[PDB]
């Protein structure tokens, strides 16, 4: 009933949108180049969230050809109306705006319903048996009516607002309260200038008048400059079960030199919203890591296991691939290991490698996995990659050398640099466990064989940040295999994946 920590969903979980279905809450994030797309969460208290799945789970729903950290799936919105869940988003690597729907969030969602109105950050609002769509073509918030089942546009598009004057007006959502249509948007861009602004009108099609107190949430001003959280924005308003008001929003945690590697994460703020009043977010339009505020009655949810095993023969919803995966290269063995089949595709090829990953969700963490490389030709490799983008990733691996010898290598890919930090000869018997640790300053790398851990050294975190590497995503930790030899049938088995955050 009192207090929680932010972020409520750590690591790469940007552009949160939430809906209330009775006493249940469901939340979606943008996923960019990753498959499956649009992670889908469930909560009873807005604080604790369980990933129950992903909205885009089949190739027919999600074409990621040539997608990267700056393309693919952008901000999604989730809405619940009359027993139907709708998820509306943009695929910028494909045909643009669309939605999918379902009556059961845990089931397979529909095929895409492609939409006419352009721009990005589409969102839906329902009233009087009608479905209204907003998005942001040419920087203007546009409104139209749609049939959400057929995707047919039923009214002409109208420009309803263009924000307070701040840059990159996006994330529009309409709500109705106290006889006003409230239009909430993001301005300022998704870096340090991020802010949430709100306008209202007696008519859904305007004219909209801005809140004199805008912005309603931002760390861009003097009041936020010292905060370890920056870039607060892309909010979605939601009602508590007790009639209180809340918002989910994105933000990030800054690192030295103004860097962030954990992506934009999902944050929660309380909102005061009196009858006939404008909303005020957490008193002064800021949020904190420790939120000492009343909450809905709290219920803990299932999280990521400290040791993930593959005995069940199914990866949980948390696991993500680069672009559209070659599904036959990920298999589960008789003794319950993850088996990854090699292809020649490296992690720098801008195509889908045999690569599957979990988001890094803590500054201080340790992750590890045993690696059993088999049927390998010379220079075939398998291991763990600390991955931001095809041009920005640190790779720790077991490599097949000549004469049945093997080694552990550590390779840093940064633009035109491909730097071999270490190449260490292995003992011919002994299962190798590869180990990646981190703190806010460095990744540390090592390996364990025959009960002895060996340090392979460290590398700065800043080179994998969004500020350095570009794009819209966060660091992921991936298991991978790449062949580089004539006619290779190499594969590698991974018995578990350990992840523990401090």
Ligand X SMILES: OC[C@@H]1O/C(=N\O)[C@H](O)[C@H]1O
Instruction: Find the shortest distance in angstroms from Cβ 375 to ligand X.
Output: 44
CA-nearest of 188, 236, 248, 240 to 215 is 188
Instruction: Find the shortest distance in angstroms from Cβ 472 to ligand X.
Output: 8
Half-sphere exposure of 128 (CA within 13 A, CB side): 4
Distance of CA 159 to the CA centre of its chain: 30
Instruction: Find the shortest distance in angstroms from Cβ 175 to ligand X.
Output: 21
Task: Give 139 or 313: the residue with its C-beta nearer to ligand X.
Answer: 139
Paired tokens of 149: 């089942």
Which residues lie near ligand X (CB under 6 A)? 168, 170, 189-191
Task: Give 96 or 478: the residue with its C-beta nearer to ligand X.
Answer: 96
Instruction: Find the shortest distance in angstroms from Cβ 287 to ligand X.
Output: 19
Paired tokens of 497: 């994946």
- Find out whether 89 and 74 touch, Cβ atoms under 8 Å: yes
Which residues are known to be catalytic?
15, 170
Instruction: Find the shortest distance in angstroms from Cβ 379 to ligand X.
Output: 39
Task: Give 53 or 172: the residue with its C-beta nearer to ligand X.
Answer: 172
- List of residues 6+ apart from 347 with CB closer than 8 A: 353, 355, 385, 387, 390, 393, 395, 413, 478, 480, 482
CA-nearest of 5, 10, 9, 4 to 260 is 10
Question: Which residue's C-beta sits nearest to ligand X?
Answer: 189
> What spatial distance separates the first Cα and last Cα of the chain, rounded to whole Å?
24
Instruction: Find the shortest distance in angstroms from Cβ 115 to ligand X.
Output: 19
Report d(CA 94, CA 66) in Å as an integer: 10
Instruction: Find the shortest distance in angstroms from Cβ 190 to ligand X.
Output: 3
Task: Give 118 or 189: the residue with its C-beta nearer to ligand X.
Answer: 189
Task: Give 234 or 411: the residue with its C-beta nearer to ligand X.
Answer: 234
Instruction: Find the shortest distance in angstroms from Cβ 36 to ligand X.
Output: 23
Report d(CA 71, CA 247) in Å as an integer: 26
Task: Give 75 or 396: the residue with its C-beta nearer to ligand X.
Answer: 75
- List of residues 6+ apart from 452 with CB closer than 8 A: none
- Find out whether 374 and 264 touch, Cβ atoms under 8 Å: no
Report d(CA 32, CA 78) in Å as an integer: 17
Q: What is the DSSP letter of 162?
A: -
Strands (E), 242-364: 245-253, 265-272, 280-281, 290-294, 307-309, 321-322, 330-332, 338-341, 354-359
Q: Which secondary structure element, helix H or strand E, spans residue 467, and what is its range? A: helix 466-469
Report d(CA 109, CA 103) in Å as an integer: 8
Task: Give 172 or 370: the residue with its C-beta nearer to ligand X.
Answer: 172
Report d(CA 186, CA 191) in Å as an integer: 12
Length of the chain: 502
Task: Give 74 or 273: the residue with its C-beta nearer to ligand X.
Answer: 74
Neighbouring CB atoms inside 10 A of 449's CB total: 18
CA-nearest of 328, 263, 208, 283 to 34 is 263
Task: Give 80 or 168: the residue with its C-beta nearer to ligand X.
Answer: 168
Instruction: Find the shortest distance in angstroms from Cβ 468 to ligand X.
Output: 15
CA-nearest of 478, 129, 114 to 325 is 478
- Find out whether 199 and 156 touch, Cβ atoms under 8 Å: no
């Amino acid at each position: 009933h009192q207090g929680y920590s932010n972020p409520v969903i750590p690591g790469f979980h940007p552009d949160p949108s939430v809906c209330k279905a009775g006493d249940d809450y469901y939340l979606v994030n943008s996923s960019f180049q990753y498959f499956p797309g649009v992670p889908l969460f469930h909560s009873k208290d807005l604080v604790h969230w369980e990933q129950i799945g992903n909205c885009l789970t089949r190739p027919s729903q999600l074409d990621l050809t040539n997608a990267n950290s700056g393309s693919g799936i952008f901000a999604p919105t989730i809405r619940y109306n009359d027993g139907v869940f709708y998820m509306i988003t943009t695929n910028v690597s494909g045909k643009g705006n669309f939605l999918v729907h379902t009556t059961d969030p845990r089931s397979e969602w529909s095929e895409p319903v492609w939409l006419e109105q352009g721009g990005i950050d589409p969102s839906l609002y329902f009233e009087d048996g009608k479905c209204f769509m907003v998005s942001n073509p040419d920087g203007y918030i546009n409104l139209c009516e749609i049939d959400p089942m057929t995707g047919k546009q039923l009214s002409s598009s109208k420009r309803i607002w263009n924000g307070t004057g701040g840059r990159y007006a996006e994330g529009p959502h309409i709500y109705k309260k106290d006889g006003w249509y409230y239009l909430l948007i993001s301005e300022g861009g998704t870096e340090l200038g991020h802010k949430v602004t709100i306008a209202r009108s007696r008519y859904i099609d305007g004219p909209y008048q801005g809140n004199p107190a805008n912005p309603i949430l931002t760390h861009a001003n003097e009041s936020g400059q010292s905060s370890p959280i920056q870039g607060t924005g892309h909010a979605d308003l939601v009602e508590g079960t007790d009639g209180s008001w809340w918002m989910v929003c994105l933000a990030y945690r800054i690192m030295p030199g103004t860097h962030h590697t954990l992506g934009r994460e999902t944050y929660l703020a309380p909102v005061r919203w009196d009858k006939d009043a404008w909303p005020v977010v957490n008193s002064n339009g800021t949020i904190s890591l420790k939120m000492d505020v009343p909450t809905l009655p709290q219920q803990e949810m299932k999280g990521r296991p400290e040791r993930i095993d593959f005995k069940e023969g199914k990866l949980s919803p948390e696991w993500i691939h680069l672009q559209n995966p070659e599904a036959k290269n990920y298999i589960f063995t008789k003794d319950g290991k993850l088996r990854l089949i090699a292809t020649p595709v490296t992690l720098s090829d801008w195509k889908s490698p045999t690569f599957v990953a979990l988001r890094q969700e803590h500054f201080d963490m340790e992750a590890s996995a045993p690696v059993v490389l088999q049927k390998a030709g010379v220079n075939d490799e398998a291991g763990i990659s600390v991955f931001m983008e095809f041009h920005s990733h640190y790779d720790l691996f077991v490599r097949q050398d000549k004469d049945r010898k093997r080694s552990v290598g550590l390779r840093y890919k940064l633009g035109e640099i491909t730097h071999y930090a270490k190449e260490v000869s292995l003992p011919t018997d002994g299962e190798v466990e590869l180990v990646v640790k981190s703190d806010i300053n460095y990744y540390y790398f090592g390996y364990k064989v025959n009960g002895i851990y060996h340090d392979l050294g460290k590398m700065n975190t800043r080179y994998l940040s969004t500020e350095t590497a570009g794009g819209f995503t966060g660091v992921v930790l991936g298991l991978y295999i790449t062949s580089a030899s004539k006619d290779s049938k190499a594969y590698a088995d991974f018995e578990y994946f350990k992840y523990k955050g401090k």
